[PDB]
Amino acid sequence: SMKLQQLRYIWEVAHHDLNVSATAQSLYTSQPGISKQIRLLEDELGVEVFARSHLTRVTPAGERIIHTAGEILRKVESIKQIAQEFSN
Amino acid sequence: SMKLQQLRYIWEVAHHDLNVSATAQSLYTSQPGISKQIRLLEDELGVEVFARSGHLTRVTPAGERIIHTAGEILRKVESIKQIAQEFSNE
Numbered sequence A: 001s002m003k004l005q006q007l008r009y010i011w012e013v014a015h016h017d018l019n020v021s022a023t024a025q026s027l028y029t030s031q032p033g034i035s036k037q038i039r040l041l042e043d044e045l046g047v048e049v050f051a052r053s054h055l056t057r058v059t060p061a062g063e064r065i066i067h068t069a070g071e072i073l074r075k076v077e078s079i080k081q082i083a084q085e086f087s088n
Numbered sequence B: 001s002m003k004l005q006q007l008r009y010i011w012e013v014a015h016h017d018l019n020v021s022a023t024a025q026s027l028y029t030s031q032p033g034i035s036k037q038i039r040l041l042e043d044e045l046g047v048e049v050f051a052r053s054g055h056l057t058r059v060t061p062a063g064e065r066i067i068h069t070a071g072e073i074l075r076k077v078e079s080i081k082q083i084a085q086e087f088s089n090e
Helices: A004-017 A021-027 A031-045 A060-085 B003-017 B022-028 B029-043 B061-088
Strands: A049-053 A055-058 B051-052 B056-059
Touching: A004 A031, A004 A060, A021 A031, A031 A055, A031 B061, A055 A060, A060 B029, A060 B061, B003 B022, B003 B029, B003 B051, B003 B061, B022 B029, B056 B061
Parallel strands: none
Antiparallel strands: A049 A055, B051 B056
16 A cells, blocks of 8 residues: 655655645645645554644654655666666 | 556566466456556566566566566565554554
């Protein structure tokens, strides 16, 4: 049930200073879409990635999950590079 | 557009002797769904992960590399679930 897009969203929200609207604008998607997908992720993981009030901070569990999400996204980039190397 | 589900599929087909129906049986999904999702993945990457003949015959040279990275990705996904479990129960 966990989606790469969900991992992309939490990584991008964290690197746009927890501003979901700015994240939405840069990823050319809606703010409700991002929020709903993050909430689906958190329900499945049973932990919250961000503290809310506005998002205020990344939680201790969130710091770990986002860091691993970044590793996953770099490996997805590695797959595209492998594909480019074995084609024209 | 690349999906975690597609990385799981190419990994499991590779570890089920390239038998897509056996792979479907283990994952509790349909064989046509799996074959179509792998094809979409190969369309997006522009290379085949498996050589074809009517049946899949072998993993391609790019396929060996891509499946290996897919395995790394799946294990990192498992670690996120492990991290979440340890914090939700603290």
